[PDB]
């Protein structure tokens, strides 16, 4: 759709759409930028991620409202039909993101910071698919999420310091995967605790600004541990 617009204009307009809180537009502009075929810079990867997280975040919130109403009514077809419509739209957005990662962001990502970033994305969007999955494929979707997160974890442990914000956010979301999707709360708690403690021990190496970035995500791990224990 964005084939006729310059890559740099797409990136500029994604930033404008973020300022305007027009996240559907933002995601379309970043989809167009990815489809130009060039690798993405650190800032550009964040724009891609912020755009789709906002879009699918709104869809997930709507799906949960409608699923709750639907469950209350099972204690006409309209509530189920409308939940299905929202669910289909959500799955389509997740499939679009996964398609961008597979064609061809992940395979061209050689540096640890890009490869871990995209694989965390892959785990997250399969996790969103798993949230609404029921039938023949819920297990395969869950294992796809797990496998992406696991590969990202293995790279992040080898290549990044324990305070790296992408490494910390990956561990946070993998722990949420364990708790909420995989029915493994003990694994979720262990991962969040070990991640927090190894970050704490590395904080002394950081500048004032890096310290702020890392401790912010460490607080999210602690918030989860407080909720889980």
């Amino acid at each position: 759709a964005m084939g006729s617009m310059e890559r740099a204009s797409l990136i500029q307009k994604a930033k404008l759409a973020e300022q305007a809180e027009r996240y559907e537009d933002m995601a379309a502009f970043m989809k167009g930028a990815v489809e130009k075929g060039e690798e993405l810079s650190c800032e550009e990867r964040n724009l891609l991620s912020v755009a789709y997280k906002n879009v699918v975040g709104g869809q997930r919130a709507a799906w949960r409202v409608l699923s709750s109403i639907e469950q209350k009514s099972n204690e006409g077809p309209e509530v189920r039909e409308y939940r299905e419509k929202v669910e289909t739209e959500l799955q389509g957005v997740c499939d679009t993101v996964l398609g961008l990662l597979d064609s061809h962001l992940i395979k061209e990502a050689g540096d640890a910071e890009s490869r871990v970033f995209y694989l965390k994305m892959k785990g997250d969007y399969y996790r969103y698919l798993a949230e609404v999955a029921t039938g023949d494929d819920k297990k395969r979707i869950i294992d796809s999420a797990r496998s992406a997160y696991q590969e990202a974890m293995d790279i992040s442990k080898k290549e990044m310091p324990p305070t790296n914000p992408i490494r910390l956010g990956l561990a946070l979301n993998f722990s949420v995967f364990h708790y909420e999707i995989a029915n493994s709360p003990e694994e979720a708690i262990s991962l969040a605790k070990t991640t927090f403690d190894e970050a704490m021990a590395d904080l002394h190496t950081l500048s004032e600004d890096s310290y702020k970035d890392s401790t912010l995500i460490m607080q999210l791990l602690r918030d989860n541990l407080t909720l889980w224990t």
Partner: peptide, 9 residues
């Protein structure tokens, strides 16, 4: 249980 908010950047 909170994942990365990830909604602002």
């Amino acid at each position: 249980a909170g994942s990365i908010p990830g909604r602002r950047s």
